[PDB]
Design a protein around this ligand. Structure first.
Ligand code: CLA
Ligand code: CLA
Ligand code: CLA
Ligand code: CLA
Ligand code: CLA
Ligand code: CLA
Ligand code: CLA
Ligand SMILES: CCCCCCCCCCCCCCCC(=O)OC[C@H](COP(=O)(O)OC[C@@H](O)CO)OC(=O)CCCCCCCCCCCCCCC
Ligand SMILES: CCCCCCCCCCCCCCCCCC(=O)OC[C@H](COP(=O)(O)O)OC(=O)CCCCCCCCCCCCCCCCC
Ligand SMILES: CC1=C(/C=C/C(C)=C/C=C/C(C)=C/C=C/C=C(C)/C=C/C=C(C)/C=C/C2=C(C)C[C@H](O)CC2(C)C)C(C)(C)C[C@H](O)C1
Ligand SMILES: CC1=C[C@H](O)CC(C)(C)[C@H]1/C=C/C(C)=C/C=C/C(C)=C/C=C/C=C(C)/C=C/C=C(C)/C=C/C1=C(C)C[C@H](O)CC1(C)C
Lengths: 741, 241, 221, 86, 41
């Protein structure tokens, strides 16, 4: 009762004795490495704080300090980015001519002929061509100097030191008690209001006072070295008044509720700025102010030290209906006592958020001169897609882990978790039927197209030239969004994106965004997306549901979350755990996200990206997606054989590195197969012969070479498979988009 | 909860707009000791259970006293240059003897006639205040030290007392004022009330300086001139002009 | 007990830094000398650094005082190149090799003193190079090597109080000299003149000739 | 600006919930609504708040209801402003 | 200290340190004596 601050003083002593002795955290790991399996389990169980202590207080404290360490690492990373922008980048040269200078921020040394990697990017500069979109970000912030990047990098280094000090302090000097961590209402109140709310409000203040006059002058077109420094704009309303007249009235309209007078910088326009190809910074100012107010409102819902407010538990307990029995009874207790439950929820929502970010950033480019930077477009989209997919698979894994370790049937009686666990066969049966049906009517359609094309019967295959499959619903939604401004969005002057329809937004002779048409090929690829997503969710859901028990192995949860098998009995029980379900879900997520990024790349290179020639848009590939994507041979020939020409012919250029990784990744992927098709027994007996060879010469180790465990063999295999595949696609995309575009 | 009635009877006995802002949690640990204890604690920051780090009843009380002393110094030093210039006793135009145009913030103004440039004065300030504050801190941690090691004979006056906020040795209490512990408590409450008033005054002076770009005494005079038009609401149009 | 680098704060490093070493004020906030073997090594290193820095700083001071009477002496930061120019028949590699070979002989002597404290006062050397010991309770070897050759005038033979007083003088002047040489390097980097040049520039006009005004310390001014 | 219709309506929309909350017309820090959300329960003193008011309108009641009054009043003033009224 | 040096002798740190030293050495050799295809003595 009563949310308050509670800490233990000096719980842990800051020594170096435990660094001298590896494996101190785990009782089983202690007593020396008798075999190399000890070496592997030392790392595999380093962060598994559950198996190092049963006290939820200690688990929570370790999690808190680890989060501080992660924040420190992220601040080191940001400091590195800003420092490289300040020193080894052509940012100041790129500001003057953002349309023809290729962004760069990493130079290499002369050491072994690698100097060739220094591209002739522009601005009288030589270096690798970055694709992280940092230049557009900095310009949107309103930087326009290389001293400001140095100041930001040094400030980020100081803040990294602060993060590391905070982690050390809150583990070793003043560590929170468990009842501090369990104040979820107060943490939610502070993450809705204080974090997201005040953060959005502060960013709106920055944009209003820094990013808006500076970028206004740059967009009018001025050498940045003449523009007044941001504090000059901030401190006197005279300059802003000459740029934005409403600043001549000050804050009086704000406190008089005559807010319409701020309409010159608080606009509702939508669309893209014609000169930059990005959203209006006035629109984003208004957006951040609005959502900051909305989050400050959101952060007052829950009850703390005063009577007003709602209780999460009371709200949860009151949502019960006829179809659910007890409903959300016990959900509160299984969320404020298990970290893996929160990790599953947060990872799922975070990966979905990343994917949404990717979508909303290709369609509606938010930074100046970022749409025209095709490399930045493609790289940012693909990167956020992959990050989202990984986070989603992690959500599945940690849902399984909670279902194995932190789930007790005593408090989960006839509530929602119990109801779901009590009919899992129905869910899995129907989801498997959906996967079958979608797989057939998505891939068999492509195979029918292939067979009809190979037979010389194009009048039979599904295409715009023959049997049509037109996305009527998607097209209707596109039209509805187009017709919004002035109808259902009366105060919006233009559509939110030039992808619904309208005109072609082209910047600097390059198309920024033009309407995207959906046809039979788009229908087919969307159903391919649905099929892959459904099989992935089937794998992960089946793992979560049958984590505890199964009609095959009822005592599965007694074997733990991560175990190889249960013997060759019952016909064979290989990969029956939840961990192996995550292991297969990784492969299916890879397949899903890979098809998604292939679809994005081909559709954008074929129907959006290109150059305007004063008479029409000449796309990079010429529109072949609409007619060639209907067949598998079309993807193998018109997208994968054709567009690989820029990566295999990259030797002796600045993209030569992309030519190496493209090959090198092909190695890693293939190498992964070693670990995925083989089994531990072969390797153990091979290592036995090797150890005999060593014994014959008195060079055998005292630490036993042991072949990798079954679980570790599978983990190594999947890690290498994903690494090889993702690196191949990354290098191919980058070389293609940095040689054309 | 419903208060304790007898506990909050003492807060009603200090009078004023207090009792209106005190809570049952506060009265569990604010019983009248520590001067200036009127029970105002809406957030339970001085709660002794689960104390640690810098959120302790001792550190918080010590910091409040240190702040009130620094703020009384700062309020007197905010008012004195401007009133002395407006009175014409000192040679500086009243728009140049303003506290924030003294070189503390070079963008906001400067007084380039110091016997050294501001950065070197800050260097000597850093060294001297490092001595003073580090000695004060090590006396807070070890409540009796700083009087054992040599210091040109100064170590005689650095014994301190019980409460770190009131060392009152041979130097810190030269005049030996408040010879009665009751009179000592009364004077402590004088010091804390004046110090809190000065905290509010210093925050007000900074906010007015941003808000009106003039001096605190000039703001006071221009408010007394026309109260209706020269006020917070009237100045809302011209704020950094 | 004794005087500390921080009055109060008796949380000085555990009693491996008790009031036994010469120059001991409990200054080891980073624990670099905790183990006894490393502590002995560090004592040797500190005394050697103090002596070498005392020699170097005295040489720099005198050479910078001569360079102010107009004597044909370069400053300390350009003496190497100036000499190499004025003596063209000498080879840099030769001088660098000879310095490393002759320094190496005596430094191997000192090394095998540190390994075996009394082993170097025998054989070719007499017995005075055996060392008088000193720190850690050793009665032989150490950074303090008595005899009639490293202590010819006998200023620490006789009167233990006088020996302790002179040991304290040596250690405190050595620490001061090390700090002074760090100052020499920093001033040369920030200004580009000699040490005595900087001192007379400062005393001539104490203002406008601080570290703020050189444009490198406070980087923006 | 003082006394104008946007001032009358702002002060009205801020003051009215302050009256409603004291006399049991609106939910405050003591009197909450049941799960139906439409019937108001009797006052509980479990919040731990004391005041010199007879009824017990605490400072937090004033903060909450005045904040909601400003939300409603800003909405009403801007809605009337943005429709040709006001 | 003793424990810090014991930590610096651990396989994870000493291996990484030795690989860094050997890599730096090969990088230096190739920086001063580049493009050496045969053992020309
Ligand atoms: C206004 C209040 C506030 C704010 C701003 C934050 C902010 C944050 N919290 Mg926090 N929290 C709060 C209140 C607040 N919290 C309260 C009252 C509780 C008690 C229930 C918690 C309990 C809590 C836990 C258990 C955890 C966090 C975590 C985090 C971080 C989220 C991770 C991230 O990357 O986000 C975005 C990153 C940023 C926005 C960068 C900003 C970094 C600055 C330095 C934030 C420091 C402000 C600090 C909270 C205010 C007091 C500090 C002061 C005493 C020195 C984030 C910085 C997580 C974390 O990462 O651990 C550290 C986490 O595990 N919070
Ligand atoms: C956290 C965000 C933030 C911050 C820090 C600021 C800060 C500032 N704003 Mg501002 N403003 C913001 C958001 C923000 N604004 C938003 C979202 C809007 C849109 C409604 C405005 C619209 C606005 C106008 C029209 C004006 C300012 C002005 C000012 C400056 C003078 C006000 C002042 O000094 O009080 C500072 C108060 C605090 C730091 C907190 C204590 C309360 C100041 C530097 C004035 C100015 O100088 O123009 C350049 C000006 O007239 N702002
Ligand atoms: C906020 C995100 C998050 C967090 C905090 C955790 C936290 C945790 N996870 Mg987890 N997980 C996540 C996301 C997350 N996970 C995601 C996104 C996935 C999908 C891949 C998984 C899938 C997963 C599985 C399958 C398992 C865990 C497990 C665990 C627990 C032990 C982890 C450990 O110490 O292993 C040790 C750390 C390592 C072995 C480091 C190696 C990890 C890979 C190989 C690095 C990849 C290489 C890297 C990208 C660089 C490649 C370049 C190369 C050339 C150098 C731990 C509490 C384990 C568990 O038992 O839970 C209790 C478990 O088996 N997680
Ligand atoms: C980021 C997450 C986070 C969270 C959830 C906490 C949470 C907590 N911290 Mg902690 N801390 C953090 C980060 C965090 N800290 C960091 C990054 C540092 C290093 C600087 C510290 C250093 C620190 C110390 C030294 C102490 C704590 C203490 C505490 C506890 C007391 C809470 C309190 O009273 O704060 C109250 C906050 C204030 C009274 C004033 C806050 C003002 C600071 C400067 C933040 C303002 C910056 C703001 C976020 C950005 C605005 C910009 C501005 C220019 C407008 C509490 C459990 C205390 C403790 O020991 O627990 C009992 C304690 O002494 N923290
Ligand atoms: C009106 C503000 C005020 C008040 C009422 C007090 C009151 C008190 N202070 Mg405090 N003090 C203040 C401001 C104040 N102080 C400020 C701004 C500082 C920072 C410099 C200090 C620093 C300080 C320390 C370090 C200590 C005290 C102590 C004390 C207590 C000792 C009794 C005493 O001498 O009373 C003070 C009487 C008055 C303040 C009335 C005089 C008012 C005039 C204007 C004073 C002007 C000073 C004078 C002109 C300078 C020359 C006089 C002298 C050199 C001959 C007492 C309760 C000591 C203590 O607690 O003993 C255990 C203690 O150690 N004070
Ligand atoms: C058809 C689905 C459905 C149904 C039948 C209910 C039914 C119920 N909900 Mg509910 N809710 C739903 C969907 C649903 N909800 C969804 C999807 C959300 C997510 C946004 C919520 C979020 C939600 C919350 C936060 C709360 C409820 C609460 C309630 C209960 C009282 C609501 C009421 O009448 O008070 C009156 C409702 C109003 C007066 C609406 C205005 C609310 C204020 C004025 C907003 C001020 C800002 C009630 C049994 C309340 C509860 O505590 O449960 C007991 C509660 O606070 N629900
Ligand atoms: C008492 C008098 C009054 C009057 C005359 C108005 C009048 C008006 N209000 Mg308003 N309002 C009032 C009080 C009043 N309000 C109060 C007390 C509040 C609470 C503080 C609000 C809060 C409010 C908000 C938040 C908004 C308005 C808006 C509007 C305008 C258009 C409403 C509309 O058609 O939305 C649109 C109708 C729709 C069907 C759109 C809904 C589609 C959503 C996005 C679907 C997504 C669902 C998702 C879950 C949410 C209109 C002129 C809107 C506006 O800003 O004007 C431009 C608006 O956003 N009002
Ligand atoms: C920055 C954002 C906001 C910060 C809020 C959080 C800060 C918390 C501060 C709370 C104070 C602590 C307890 C106070 C409790 C308290 O007040 O103590 C009572 C106070 C002093 O009491 P004493 O210490 O003298 O007690 C002894 C006597 O009271 C005996 O009865 O007496 C007063 O009434 C003075 C206050 C008058 C206030 C004058 C201000 C006039 C402004 C009016 C504005 C209205 C119009 C505005 C139009 C725009
Ligand atoms: C840089 C780190 C270099 C550490 C050198 C060896 C440390 C050994 C030691 O301090 O003994 C532990 C020492 C006690 O000595 P011990 O009994 O011999 O272990 O523990 C402490 O009192 C403080 C431990 C913190 C050590 C410094 C950490 C780094 C400080 C700079 C932060 C950045
Ligand atoms: C480990 C450690 C150290 C060192 C310990 C070592 C490494 C002892 C053994 C050292 C040895 C064998 C050093 C050998 C050095 C050879 C040198 C320095 C040759 C130098 C000649 C050069 C660089 C070139 C001269 C040209 C000149 C300029 C003119 C032309 O004609 C051309 C050319 C020949 C190229 C020191 C620092 C001394 C102290 C100790 O405390 C720590
Ligand atoms: C009680 C409580 C409890 C509950 O529970 C919670 C809460 C609510 C949180 C609370 C409250 C709080 C508050 C009110 C706070 C505030 C404070 C302040 C304002 C301070 C200041 C404070 C203030 C201060 C220090 C000030 C100081 C000042 C100074 C130094 C100044 C200086 C100067 C001068 C002379 C002049 C020149 O030319 C400049 C300079 C050099 C600059």
């Amino acid at each position: 009762k009563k949310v308050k601050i509670v800490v233990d003083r000096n719980p842990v002593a800051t020594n170096f004795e435990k660094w001298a002795k590896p494996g101190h955290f785990s009782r089983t790991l202690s007593k020396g490495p008798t075999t190399t399996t000890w070496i592997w389990n030392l790392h595999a169980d380093a962060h598994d704080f559950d198996t190092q202590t049963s006290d939820l207080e200690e688990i929570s404290r370790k999690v808190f300090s680890a989060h501080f360490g992660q924040l420190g690492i992220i601040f080191i990373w940001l400091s590195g980015m800003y420092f490289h922008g300040a020193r080894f980048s052509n940012y100041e040269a790129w500001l003057t001519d953002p349309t023809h200078i290729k962004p760069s921020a990493q130079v290499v040394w002369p050491i072994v002929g690698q100097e060739i990697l220094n591209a002739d990017v522009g601005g009288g500069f030589q270096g690798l061509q970055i694709t992280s979109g940092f230049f557009q970000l900095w310009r949107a912030a309103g930087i326009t100097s290389e001293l400001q990047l140095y100041t930001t990098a040094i400030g980020a280094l100081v803040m990294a030191a602060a993060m590391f000090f905070a982690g050390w302090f809150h583990y070793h000097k003043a560590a929170p008690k468990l009842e501090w961590f369990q104040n979820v209402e107060s943490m939610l109140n502070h993450h809705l209001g204080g974090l997201l709310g005040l953060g959005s409000l502060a960013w709106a203040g920055h944009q209003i006072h820094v990013s808006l006059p500076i970028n206004k002058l740059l967009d009018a077109g001025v050498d940045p070295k003449e523009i007044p420094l941001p504090h000059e704009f901030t401190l006197n309303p005279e300059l802003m008044a000459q740029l934005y007249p409403s600043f001549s009235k000050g804050l009086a309209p704000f406190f008089t509720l005559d807010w319409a007078q701020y309409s010159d910088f608080l606009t509702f326009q939508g669309g893209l700025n014609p000169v930059t190809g990005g959203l209006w910074l006035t629109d984003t100012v208004h957006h951040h102010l609005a959502i900051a107010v909305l989050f400050l409102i959101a952060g007052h819902q829950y009850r703390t030290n005063w009577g007003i407010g709602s209780s999460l538990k009371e709200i949860l307990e009151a949502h019960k209906g006829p179809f659910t029995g007890e409903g959300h009874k016990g959900l509160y207790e299984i969320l404020t006592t298990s970290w893996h439950a929160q990790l599953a929820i947060n990872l799922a929502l975070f990966g979905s958020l990343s994917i949404i970010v990717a979508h909303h950033m290709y369609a509606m480019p938010p930074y100046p001169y970022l749409a025209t930077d095709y490399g930045t477009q493609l790289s940012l989209f693909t990167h956020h897609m992959w990050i989202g997919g990984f986070c989603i698979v992690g959500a599945g894994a940690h849902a399984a882990i909670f279902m194995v370790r932190d789930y007790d049937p005593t408090n989960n009686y006839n509530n929602l978790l119990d109801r779901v666990l009590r009919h899992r066969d129905a869910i899995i049966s129907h989801l498997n039927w959906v996967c079958i049906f979608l797989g057939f009517h998505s891939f068999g359609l492509y195979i029918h197209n292939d067979t009809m094309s190979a037979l010389g019967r194009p009048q039979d295959m599904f295409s715009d030239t023959a049997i049509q499959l037109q996305p009527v619903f998607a097209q209707w939604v596109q039209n509805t969004h187009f017709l919004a401004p002035g109808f259902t969005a009366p105060n919006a002057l233009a559509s939110t994106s030039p992808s619904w329809g309208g005109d072609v937004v082209a910047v600097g002779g390059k198309v920024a965004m033009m309407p995207i048409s959906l046809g039979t090929a788009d229908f087919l690829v969307h159903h391919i997306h649905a099929f892959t997503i459904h099989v992935t969710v089937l794998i992960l859901l089946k793992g979560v549901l049958y984590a505890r028990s199964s009609r095959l192995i009822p005592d599965k949860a007694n074997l733990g979350f991560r175990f190889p098998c249960d013997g060759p009995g019952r016909g064979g029980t290989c990969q029956v755990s939840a961990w192996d379900h995550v292991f297969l879900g990784l492969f299916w997520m890879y397949n899903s996200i890979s098809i998604v990024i292939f679809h994005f790349s081909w559709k954008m290179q074929s129907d959006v990206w290109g150059t305007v020639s004063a008479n029409g848009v000449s796309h990079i590939t010429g529109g072949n997606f609409a007619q060639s994507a209907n067949t598998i041979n079309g993807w193998l020939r018109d997208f994968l054989w054709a567009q690989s020409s820029q990566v295999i012919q990259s030797y002796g250029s600045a993209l030569s590195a992309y030519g190496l990784i493209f090959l090198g990744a092909h190695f890693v992927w293939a190498f992964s197969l070693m670990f995925l098709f083989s089994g531990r027994g072969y390797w153990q007996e091979l290592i036995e012969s090797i150890v005999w060879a060593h014994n014959k010469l008195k060079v055998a180790p005292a630490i036993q070479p042991r072949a990798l465990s079954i679980t570790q063999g599978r983990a190594v295999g999947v890690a290498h498979y994903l690494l090889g595949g993702i690196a191949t696609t990354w290098s191919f995309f980058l070389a293609r988009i940095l040689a054309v575009g | 909860e419903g208060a304790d009635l007898a506990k909050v009877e003492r807060v009603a006995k200090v009078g004023g707009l207090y009792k209106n802002f005190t809570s049952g949690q506060a009265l569990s640990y604010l019983d009248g000791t520590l001067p200036g204890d009127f029970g105002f604690d809406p957030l339970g920051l001085c709660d002794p259970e689960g104390a640690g780090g810098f959120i302790t009843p001792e550190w918080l009380s010590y910091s409040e006293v240190i702040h009130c002393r620094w703020a009384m110094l700062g309020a007197a030093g905010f008012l004195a240059p401007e009133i002395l210039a407006t009175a014409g006793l000192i040679p500086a135009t009243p728009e140049e003897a303003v506290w924030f145009r003294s070189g503390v913030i070079p963008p906001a103004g400067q007084y380039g006639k110091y016997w050294m440039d501001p950065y070197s004065l800050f260097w000597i300030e850093a060294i001297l205040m490092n001595f003073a504050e580090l000695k004060r801190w090590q006396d807070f941690k070890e409540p009796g030290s700083q009087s054992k090691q040599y210091f040109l004979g100064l170590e005689a006056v650095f014994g301190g007392s019980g409460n770190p906020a009131y060392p009152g040795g041979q130097w810190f209490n030269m005049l030996n004022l408040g010879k009665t512990p009751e009179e000592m408590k009364k004077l402590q409450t004088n010091e804390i009330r004046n110090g809190r008033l000065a905290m509010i005054a210093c925050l007000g002076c900074a906010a007015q300086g941003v808000m009106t770009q003039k001096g605190p005494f000039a703001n006071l005079l221009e408010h007394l001139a026309d109260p209706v038009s020269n006020n917070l609401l009237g100045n809302l149009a011209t704020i950094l002009k | 007990v004794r005087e500390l680098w921080f009055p109060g704060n008796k949380e000085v490093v555990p009693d491996y830094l008790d009031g036994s070493l010469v120059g001991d004020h409990g200054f080891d906030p980073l624990g670099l000398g905790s183990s006894p073997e490393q502590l002995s090594w560090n004592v040797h290193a500190e005394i050697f650094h103090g002596r070498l820095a005392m020699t170097g700083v005295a040489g720099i001071l005198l050479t910078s005082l001569l360079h102010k009477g107009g004597a044909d002496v370069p400053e300390w930061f350009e003496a190497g190149r100036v000499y190499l120019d004025r003596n063209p028949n000498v080879d840099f590699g030769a001088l660098l090799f000879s310095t490393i070979v002759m320094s190496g002989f005596v430094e191997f002597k000192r090394l095998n003193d540190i390994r075996n404290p009394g082993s170097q006062g025998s054989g070719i050397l007499p017995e005075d190079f055996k060392g008088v010991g000193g720190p850690q309770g050793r009665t032989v070897g150490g950074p303090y090597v008595g005899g009639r050759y490293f202590d010819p005038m006998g200023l620490c033979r006789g009167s233990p109080e006088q020996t302790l007083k002179y040991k304290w003088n040596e250690i405190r002047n050595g620490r001061l000299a090390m700090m002074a040489f760090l100052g020499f390097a920093a001033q040369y980097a920030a200004t580009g003149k000699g040490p005595i040049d900087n001192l007379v520039d400062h005393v001539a006009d104490p203002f406008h000739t601080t570290f703020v005004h050189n444009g490198v310390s406070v980087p923006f001014i | 600006y003082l006394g104008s219709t946007t001032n009358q309506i702002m002060v009205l929309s801020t003051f009215l919930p302050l009256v409603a909350g004291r006399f049991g017309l609106a939910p405050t820090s003591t009197r909450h609504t049941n799960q139906s959300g439409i019937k108001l329960l009797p006052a509980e003193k479990s919040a731990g708040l004391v005041s010199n008011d007879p009824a017990g309108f605490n400072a937090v009641d004033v903060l909450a209801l005045g904040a909601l009054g400003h939300i409603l009043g800003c909405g009403i003033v801007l809605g009337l402003k943005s429709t040709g009224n006001l | 200290m003793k424990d810090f040096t014991t930590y610096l002798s651990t396989a994870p740190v000493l291996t990484l340190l030795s690989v860094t030293v050997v890599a730096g050495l090969l990088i230096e050799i190739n920086r001063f004596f580049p493009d050496a295809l045969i053992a020309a003595f």
